[PDB]
Design a protein around this ligand. Structure first.
Ligand SMILES: CCCCCCCCCCCCCCCCCC(=O)OC[C@H](COP(=O)([O-])OCC(O)COP(=O)([O-])OC[C@@H](COC(=O)CCCCCCCCCCCCCCCCC)OC(=O)CCCCCCCCCCCCCCCCC)OC(=O)CCCCCCCCCCCCCCCCC
Ligand SMILES: CCCCCCCCCCCCCCCCCC(=O)OC[C@H](COP(=O)([O-])OCC(O)COP(=O)([O-])OC[C@@H](COC(=O)CCCCCCCCCCCCCCCCC)OC(=O)CCCCCCCCCCCCCCCCC)OC(=O)CCCCCCCCCCCCCCCCC
Ligand code: BCL
Ligand SMILES: CC[C@H]1c2cc3[nH]c4c(c3C)C(=O)[C@H](C(=O)OC)c4c3nc(cc4[nH]c(cc(n2)[C@@H]1C)c(C(C)=O)c4C)[C@@H](C)[C@@H]3CCC(=O)OC/C=C(/C)CCC[C@H](C)CCC[C@H](C)CCCC(C)C
Ligand SMILES: CC[C@H]1c2cc3[nH]c4c(c3C)C(=O)[C@H](C(=O)OC)c4c3nc(cc4[nH]c(cc(n2)[C@@H]1C)c(C(C)=O)c4C)[C@@H](C)[C@@H]3CCC(=O)OC/C=C(\C)CCC[C@H](C)CCC[C@H](C)CCCC(C)C
Ligand SMILES: COC(C)(C)C/C=C/C(C)=C/C=C/C(C)=C/C=C/C(C)=C/C=C\C=C(C)\C=C\C=C(C)\C=C\C=C(C)\C=C\CC(C)(C)OC
Ligand code: HEC
Ligand code: HEC
Ligand code: HEC
Ligand SMILES: CCCCCCCCCCCCO[C@@H]1O[C@H](CO)[C@@H](O[C@H]2O[C@H](CO)[C@@H](O)[C@H](O)[C@H]2O)[C@H](O)[C@H]1O
Ligand SMILES: CCCCCCCCCCCCCCCC(=O)O
Ligand SMILES: [Fe+3]
Ligand SMILES: [Mg+2]
Lengths: 278, 46, 46, 47, 336, 274, 318, 46
């Protein structure tokens, strides 16, 4: 053909602009997949996957990039993927047995999967130092120390329509089996996220009234009848929720312990959840 | 009706009155421009 | 009427007044540019 | 209540009203000149 | 809002999305009913040009067929008025009324299109009733959009655009599409016929494209069609990818342009002031003046053969290509 | 092979069907019963597509499995007259539905909510609107779109111009608004997270304080870490849903030009001015 | 019966966050900040304060001038009737210059007001770009948002300025109206032969659809893993929690590959800005180096061929 | 009139005045360029 844009008898400028973008899109796709390989890589090929019956490491394609250094606010240059998390995962002895020796067989937990961190109950290896705001305050703290927060975004809504702006303090907690686990005594708020994160409760229903346990808010269904319904775990199972090292702080690790325990209830709280519909 | 200011916040009411009257005065003036008999800049016979 | 300047920050009132005058003057000038009789740059006869 | 006092607010009000007087007088003159150029209130016969 | 059931028809190959969807509950069913034709009266004896004092168009009709035609035209254009709609009382040889001169032009035009425009109307032809439908005026005429001689330094200059108009089927498209194409003969093509640009040979503006778009908006709603019935919109300027409706409606454009430029506009001088549009122009024919929202006007009823007198003689000068397409021999000087 | 943290999560349970029989991983993919089904459905549909391609042309863009003629109504057609399209439709529908059920098995196993399968059910709803629901209401499977890279673009073009200006479709203007707004929100969300975790070189990784401060500095409002993902899901799901609405009302509930639909607005007694 | 992380049930209100401290040359922020219950259900409840500096003020002034010009011309086109303005609100527009002016400066009422509105609108969006850039730098953040915005600016400039300039006429540009700029969008495709066959329009749609796909995937995944504080994504990038692992494992098990908490936002960022960049390139190619996109597609063998169903029309004027 | 600078911030009034006059100067110069009687570059007859 002829006209403006012709490069040969067949090639034209728009077509070669397109292939130019193909080369860029590939280089971007390869670059994006490398950024994908900074967590969990290199892959751990177990012995039972390889014909030589030896554990190995697979880079995949594209191979992972070099380690990446995140300088942190408190003056700590962390490298990603983090060495301590990889070392914890590779050395932890799981309390589970594969349902079959071949690769891809699911693990069947031996003891109690909820307290052993198996499957939906699992936790990552995180820091034990409680998080801080940019200004140095305690990031996730209960309302008894984070006294500048009051429950309820709108005072008028909380006073005249408390159903849609509730205050769950003093609410009874029920498990997936309808049994009473205790009473909510406090609310934990993230000073950065400006949201409730945990509902601290006592175990007055299934244990000691003086015991304190954190219930993650995303596992709590704060009702309209002064009852909080947790579908994750049975009411009797609130006693084994991991306790805080310090009654007034939570490390990111304990957040993974506590949310992990409730997440494990989705499969292990009662018999039959693991079992299919049919 | 000085008690009206124990109900309606006077600072916000004054501002919203000026804003609201700005829209209404502009709207009424514009409506008169659109009519044939009251567009003073066009000067049609009455 | 002087108590208005205790109710509001005078800096805010001035900024609001001027911001309004600037838009109002521009709307009026644009309106006159629209009409035949008062378009001064167009220079159309009467 | 802003940081102004009764004396400070009275000072702003007087200067503000004087500023309104000067600004309005300039506009009024600008309207006498505009009326002399081309009047804007049409008669019953129009223009 | 509408609802099912909807009548569907396939216009192109399966999977091309070329389909017509119609709502059967939206059809009038009375506007499109063809009147029952009168019985064939005799064609014997002397012609009308030998009987009547003032006859110039229907000269070669019998006395019986002349009066049958006159009564048929009365039902078609003025049933509630009678013969005195066009005739000055009892003096039928008088041409005083403007409706008489207009109707004399309307017979000459009705004869002309029926004899020369089978490239569009095939064999159906048209009758006074195809456009009038029992009314003094066709319900579906158009006037020229007013041209206000803009300030050039003012504000709000719509360039025939940016207002919802029934002319443009409630789009903001140019409202003067009828003037440019149904009375004028401006080019309708918007697509370059080459892969690569030749900007100095083909540089149609988007404003011209939207004007051709606005005519297509009308031509769709005016015949109860859509863009798909005349086009494969993936390849809009490919004639071999278009149904035969596109070729037919091509002549519908040039016939409507012929009706407006050569037969309707000459009547503008002697119209009453009440009849004229805002610009002072005569009401003109668009696609819906005959179709009224249906592909086949009056359900495709062939009414012409029932009435001798509405068919003329096939002109030796007719081209259908001499209306703005390689020549302007079929158009008068004025157009618009 | 597995991610260096992946092993502890690979447990038994979470299936809806199949139980232990299909509850395993092949490489990285969890299989499940709906993975076997989605594999059979996907391979069947893809191989049937290639067979249809072998009968007209192998050019990738020009491959087209077209729906049957409208004259067929809802009847199943001969294979080379749109019956091949109909089988591919039931294969693709099954492939999509078992894909979402499989993502539901994966959701339960990792203790996640069912947001992903449900958000995918909206996408499946839009395809079902295109090939099942709208062809049903109009009365023929031939109203669905052809299975071809460039042949389904002509379908979109012609179906859009069946209403003479598809931009005036009120539900389509809403869906386009949701599509434009969600990629705007995606640009802001992706950019803000990268801007915090990747500040100027020599700066610490910032906080959620800086994220809220940035948008309060720019537009005067910040939706937060949690709000951006609710709104992001909301905008994209409304984009899919109003896509379904805009196409389901084009033909079953509106047969005229979409610009004419706005005649009610032009006739509101409040602002007729005539 | 599980909580779906769709609305925040329990909210807690504290003092208004005044924002992170700025350098000691920035303008003071506004003092106005209030909390909204309705907005607090979806997310952060605080509305305001807002910063306004040199770039912000000048962007607002240039933008207000543009909006006033468009609005007053829109209102003037309906004879100044506010009622007729509402009736015709979607149909009115500030019309671009007619083709006869080329790239010259046309009279105010013949596209001159359009050119001024386009110039001030371009200046406001460019200053707003500098504002987004500087607000990020003032907080010590990366300039990713600004460059993503710059990508959207480039399509805006390609459509309205660069392509009309490359074509030699301001008529080719898009009017300031709701339905009129939709008329421009359709007519553009009609004129240059079905923009569907433009490959960079195809790619533009790929990244636009993939952006909605990505936000739906990512937003649903963060809500689904909200039980493990997934939405605190900055903590998960610097300290990989179980939520980051379950999000990655979910997609690794589904489609065989995953991302990270950080790399997902690189995927979404690039999909958002590539949509608008291939859009700009596709617009710049048509009219300049491609006349008809269907004919271009025929040449490169991408146009499907259709068997006979109807009698083909023949151009009478052939 | 120096007391104006004890109300308004002279630092941000100066920045605002400069950017405000920049917008107006471009607007006016461009309006004049879009008139036949004052486009000094087109140089149409006066
Ligand atoms: C631009 C727009 C247009 C273009 C759009 C894109 C074009 C179309 C889409 C194409 C994109 C997808 C292509 C790849 C799919 C992903 C597969 C995959 O794993 O990716 C790996 C790859 C990275 O590799 P890796 O995971 O690091 O590999 C590490 C080791 O090799 C890991 O080693 P290993 O131990 O995992 O080795 C596994 C090996 C071992 O095999 C065995 O031994 C099996 C024995 C069993 C008996 O084989 C397998 O087990 C897996 C084979 C497949 C099994 C399928 C079974 C599924 C059952 C049903 C589930 C439903 C599916 O990720 C990708 O490149 C895919 C993304 C690229 C495209 C992104 C989207 C582009 C969009 C542009 C806009
Ligand atoms: C005509 C069409 C073009 C018109 C464009 C006009 C509008 C321009 C806006 C488009 C760019 C927006 C995105 C750029 C961006 O990522 O900004 C973040 C970044 C934030 O900077 P920062 O705050 O200093 O970063 C602090 C830390 O470094 C934190 O930084 P970080 O670690 O987050 O950033 C690292 C970033 C580095 O990012 C960059 O340096 C910018 C990206 C470089 C390429 C951008 C070109 C995109 C447009 C063209 C693409 C299509 C062309 C195809 C052919 C023609 C058709 O990572 C990458 O490398 C991304 C690029 C992907 C890998 C390279 C793929 C190419 C291989 C294939 C080619 C060979 C085969 O902004 C820039 O670095 C400046 C970008 C200026 C781009 C001007 C063009
Ligand atoms: C000239 C034609 C008309 C027009 C006619 C139409 C018609 C007809 C339609 C649209 C539809 C749409 N139009 Mg439109 N449209 C026009 C111009 C535009 C413009 C523009 C630039 O002006 C924009 C931005 C849009 C935008 C849109 C969207 C709102 C919508 C498409 C998104 C969607 O449906 O998601 C939904 C996403 C899906 C349906 C994808 C389904 C995903 C399934 C579940 C999974 C598939 C997996 C796959 C097989 C996996 C592959 C294998 C692996 C990769 C290995 N249109 C013009 C004016 N438009 C469509 C719509 O809304 O339908 C719902 C539609 O039918
Ligand atoms: C509704 C909001 C948006 C959305 C959401 C969405 N999509 C999703 C999800 C979500 C939440 C997933 O979780 C799921 C996923 O896991 O993605 C990685 C998915 C997905 N969306 C996909 C694609 C996709 N989404 C699209 C759109 C959208 N997805 C919306 C804009 C589009 C468009 C607009 O075209 C496409 C192409 C996949 C990547 C994936 C679903 C994968 C799947 O279902 O796999 C099943 C098995 C297969 C191999 C599919 C093919 C099997 C068939 C038998 C053959 C092909 C038949 C088909 C009819 C061919 C048509 C071709 C022609 C049109 C050219
Ligand atoms: C990746 C490409 C996508 C994208 C990205 C994108 N857009 C962006 C950004 C990014 C990354 C920004 O950072 C920027 C932004 O601010 O985001 C919130 C923006 C933005 N994208 C916007 C719009 C937008 N983006 C679009 C599209 C897209 N944006 C793409 C799909 C579109 C479409 C689909 O057409 C639109 C319409 C803006 C909301 C914003 C940039 C705003 C801007 O430039 O404003 C300039 C200034 C003005 C217009 C001045 C007038 C404004 C007010 C009227 C002034 C008020 C005066 C006074 C303060 C008050 C007066 C009243 C009194 C009574 C009080
Ligand atoms: C009367 O109204 C008041 C005052 C009350 C306020 C109301 C205002 C209202 C209601 C305004 C309504 C506005 C609307 C609805 C606007 C709609 C706008 C739309 C949809 C716009 C869409 C697209 C427009 C585009 C993309 C415009 C592009 C134009 C560009 C990019 C122009 C670029 C021009 C430049 C860079 C100028 C260059 C000038 C130079 C100096 C180069 O010339 C020599
Ligand atoms: C469509 C192409 C037409 C056909 C066929 C016939 N007429 Fe017509 N006629 C047509 C138009 C567009 C108009 C103008 C209507 C308007 O609003 O001004 C007319 C007008 C007349 C008139 C004048 C009516 C009046 O002004 O009161 C008459 C008397 C008339 N037409 C008669 C007529 C007859 C007798 C026809 C058949 C032979 C005929 N018309 C055909 C459009 C069309
Ligand atoms: C038949 C009644 C038609 C309908 C319905 C629509 N179109 Fe059409 N279109 C038709 C013809 C006969 C022609 C050729 C006109 C000529 O004189 O050459 C056209 C032409 C176009 C064009 C110009 C394309 C070109 O040749 O370069 C366009 C852009 C166009 N048509 C678009 C179009 C649209 C969008 C329609 C639906 C609303 C539509 N047309 C309907 C006949 C008919
Ligand atoms: C307008 C549409 C007409 C109506 C209604 C009627 N007539 Fe008519 N008539 C009309 C015209 C234009 C002409 C001129 C004929 C020509 O070809 O030039 C006529 C003519 C007659 C005549 C002939 C009179 C003569 O020339 O001496 C007669 C007798 C006649 N018309 C009778 C007639 C009757 C009885 C009508 C009522 C039913 C009638 N006409 C209605 C136009 C129109
Ligand atoms: C509720 C609407 O449900 C839908 O209605 C329409 C019309 O009633 C039916 O459509 C049915 O009638 C239409 C009438 O034109 C036939 O052409 C079509 O072949 C037939 O299937 C759909 O098959 C039905 O699913
Ligand atoms: C928002 C509400 C819009 C309602 C519009 C109703 C229009 C009804 C007539 C057309 C139908 O469709
Ligand atoms: Fe995110
Ligand atoms: Mg337009």
């Amino acid at each position: 053909m002829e006209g403006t844009g012709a490069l040969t008898d067949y090639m034209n400028v728009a077509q070669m602009t397109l292939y130019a973008f193909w080369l860029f899109l590939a280089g971007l796709i390869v670059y994006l997949r490398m950024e994908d390989k900074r967590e969990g890589y290199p892959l751990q090929a177990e012995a039972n996957e390889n014909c030589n019956r030896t554990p190995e490491k697979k880079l995949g394609f594209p191979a992972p990039p070099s380690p990446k250094v995140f300088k942190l606010a408190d003056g700590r240059s962390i490298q990603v993927p983090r060495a301590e998390k990889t070392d914890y995962e590779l050395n932890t002895q799981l309390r589970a047995e594969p349902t079959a020796p071949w690769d891809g067989a699911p693990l069947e937990p031996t003891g109690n999967p909820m307290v052993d961190g198996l499957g939906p109950a699992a936790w990552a290896k995180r820091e034990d130092e409680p998080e801080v705001t940019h200004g140095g305050k305690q990031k996730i703290c209960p309302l008894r120390v984070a006294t500048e927060f009051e429950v309820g975004m709108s005072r008028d809504v909380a006073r005249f329509w408390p159903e849609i702006d509730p205050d769950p303090r003093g609410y009874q907690v029920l498990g997936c089996d309808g049994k009473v686990a205790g009473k909510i005594v406090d609310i934990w708020v993230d000073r950065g996220e400006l949201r409730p994160m945990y509902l601290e409760m006592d175990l007055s229903g299934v244990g000691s009234s003086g015991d304190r346990v954190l219930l993650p808010i995303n596992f709590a269904r704060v009702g309209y009848d002064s009852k909080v319904r947790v579908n994750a775990i049975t009411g009797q199972q609130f006693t084994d929720v991991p306790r805080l090292r310090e009654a007034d702080r939570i490390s990111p690790q304990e957040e993974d312990f506590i949310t992990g325990y409730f997440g494990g209830g989705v499969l292990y709280a009662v018999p039959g959840r693991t079992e299919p519909f049919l | 009706m000085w008690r009206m200011w124990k109900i309606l916040d006077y600072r916000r009411t004054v501002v919203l009155a000026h804003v609201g009257m700005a829209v209404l005065a502009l709207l009424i003036h514009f409506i008169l421009l659109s009519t044939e008999n009251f567009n003073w800049l066009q000067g049609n016979p009455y | 009427m002087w108590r208005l300047w205790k109710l509001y920050d005078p800096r805010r009132v001035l900024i609001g007044i001027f911001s309004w005058l600037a838009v109002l003057a521009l709307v009026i000038h644009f309106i006159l540019l629209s009409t035949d009789r008062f378009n001064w740059v167009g220079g159309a006869a009467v | 209540l802003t940081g102004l006092s009764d004396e400070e607010a009275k000072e702003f009000h007087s200067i503000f009203m004087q500023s309104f007087l000067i600004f309005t007088a300039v506009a009024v003159v600008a309207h006498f000149l505009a009326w002399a150029w081309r009047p804007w209130i049409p008669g019953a016969e129009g223009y | 809002c509408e609802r099912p059931p909807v009548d569907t028809e396939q216009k192109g190959y399966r999977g091309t999305g070329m389909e017509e969807v119609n709502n059967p509950r939206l059809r009038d069913d009375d506007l499109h009913l063809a009147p029952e034709a009168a019985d064939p009266v005799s064609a014997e004896g002397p012609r009308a040009g030998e009987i009547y004092q003032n006859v110039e168009v229907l000269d070669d009709l019998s006395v019986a067929e002349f009066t049958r035609l006159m009564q048929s035209m009365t039902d078609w254009v003025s049933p509630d008025e009678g013969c005195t709609y066009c005739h000055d009382g009892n003096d039928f040889a008088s041409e005083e009324l403007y409706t008489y001169q207009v109707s004399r032009q309307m017979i000459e035009m009705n004869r002309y299109v029926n004899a020369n425009w089978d490239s569009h109307m095939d064999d159906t032809g048209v009758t006074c009733y195809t456009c009038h439908r029992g009314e003094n005026l066709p319900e579906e005429s158009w006037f020229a959009e007013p041209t206000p001689d803009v300030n050039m330094a003012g504000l709000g200059n719509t360039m025939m655009q940016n207002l919802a108009s029934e002319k443009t089927e409630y789009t903001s498209l140019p409202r003067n599409a009828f003037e440019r194409y149904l009375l004028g003969h401006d080019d309708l093509r918007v697509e370059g016929d080459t892969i690569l640009p030749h900007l100095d040979e083909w540089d149609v503006s988007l404003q011209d494209t939207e004007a051709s778009y606005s005519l297509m908006m009308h031509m769709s709603a005016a015949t109860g069609s859509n863009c798909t019935t005349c086009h494969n919109t993936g390849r809009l300027g490919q004639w071999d990818e278009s149904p035969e409706e596109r070729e037919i409606s091509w002549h519908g454009i040039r016939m409507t342009r012929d009706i407006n430029a050569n037969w309707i506009e000459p009547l503008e001088a002697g119209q009453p002031e009440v009849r004229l549009g805002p610009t002072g122009d005569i009401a003109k024919v668009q696609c819906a003046t005959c179709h009224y929202g249906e592909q086949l006007p009056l359900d495709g009823a062939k009414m012409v053969d029932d009435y001798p007198g509405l068919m003329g003689e096939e002109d030796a000068d007719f081209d259908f290509l001499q209306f703005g397409d390689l020549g302007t021999d079929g158009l008068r000087d004025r157009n618009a | 092979a597995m991610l260096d943290f992946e092993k502890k999560y690979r447990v038994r349970g979470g299936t809806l069907l199949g139980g232990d029989l299909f509850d395993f991983w092949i490489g990285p993919f969890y299989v499940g019963i709906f993975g076997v089904l989605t594999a059979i459905f996907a391979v069947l549909g893809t191989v049937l597509i290639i067979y249809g391609a072998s009968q007209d042309t192998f050019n990738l863009w020009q491959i087209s499995i077209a729906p049957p003629d409208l004259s067929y109504g809802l009847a199943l057609a001969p294979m080379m007259e749109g019956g091949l399209w109909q089988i591919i439709t039931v294969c693709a529908l099954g492939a999509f539905i078992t894909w979402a059920l499989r993502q539901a098995e994966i959701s339960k196993k990792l203790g996640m909510g069912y947001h992903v399968p449900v958000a995918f059910a909206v996408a499946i709803l839009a395809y079902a609107t295109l090939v099942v629901f709208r062809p049903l209401l109009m009365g023929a499977w031939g109203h669905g779109f052809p299975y071809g890279i460039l042949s389904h673009l002509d379908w979109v073009s012609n179906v859009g111009y069946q209403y003479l200006h598809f931009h005036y479709n009120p539900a389509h203007m809403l869906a386009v608004t949701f599509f434009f707004t969600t990629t705007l929100a995606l640009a802001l969300h992706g950019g803000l997270i990268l801007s915090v975790t990747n500040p100027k070189k020599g700066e610490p990784v910032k906080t959620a304080e800086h994220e809220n401060t940035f948008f309060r500095d720019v537009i005067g409002y910040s939706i937060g870490s949690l709000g951006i993902h609710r709104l992001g899901l909301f905008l994209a799901l409304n984009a899919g849903f109003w896509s379904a609405v805009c196409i389901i009302i084009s033909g079953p509930f509106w047969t005229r030009g979409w610009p004419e639909w706005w005649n009610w607005w032009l006739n509101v007694p409040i602002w007729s001015w005539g | 019966a599980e909580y779906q992380n769709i609305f925040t049930r329990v909210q807690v209100r504290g003092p208004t966050d005044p924002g992170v401290e700025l350098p000691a040359a920035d303008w003071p922020r506004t003092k106005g900040a209030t909390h909204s219950w309705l907005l607090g259900k979806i997310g952060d409840a605080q509305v305001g304060p807002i910063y306004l500096g040199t770039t912000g003020v000048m962007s607002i002034l240039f933008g207000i001038v543009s909006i006033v010009i468009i609005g007053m011309n829109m209102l003037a086109s309906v004879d100044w009737s506010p009622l007729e303005f509402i009736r015709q609100f979607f149909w009115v527009a500030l019309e671009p210059p007619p083709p006869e002016y080329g790239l010259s400066l046309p009279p105010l009422n013949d596209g001159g007001w359009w050119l001024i509105a386009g110039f001030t609108l371009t200046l406001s969006v460019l200053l707003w770009f500098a504002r987004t850039y500087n607000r990020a730098r003032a907080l010590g953040l990366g300039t990713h948002v600004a460059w993503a915005f710059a990508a959207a600016i480039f399509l805006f400039l390609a459509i309205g300025f660069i392509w009309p300039v490359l074509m030699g006429s301001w008529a080719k540009s898009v009017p300031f109206g709701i339905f009129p700029h939709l008329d421009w969008t359709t007519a553009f495709s009609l004129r240059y032969g079905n923009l569907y066959y433009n490959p960079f329009h195809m790619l533009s749609i790929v990244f636009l659809f993939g952006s909605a796909l990505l936000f739906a995937m990512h937003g649903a995944t963060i809500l689904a893993a909200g039980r493990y504080n997934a939405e605190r994504e900055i903590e998960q990038i610097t300290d990989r929690g179980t939520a980051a692992e379950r999000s990655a494992l979910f997609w690794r098990w589904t489609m065989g590959f995953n991302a990270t908490m950080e790399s997902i936002h690189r995927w979404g960022y690039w999909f958002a800005i590539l949509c608008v960049i291939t859009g700009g390139i596709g617009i710049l190619l048509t009219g300049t180096v491609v006349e008809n996109w269907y004919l271009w597609g025929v040449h490169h063998g991408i146009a499907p061929e259709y068997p006979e169903f109807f009698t083909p029309a023949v151009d009478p004027a052939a």
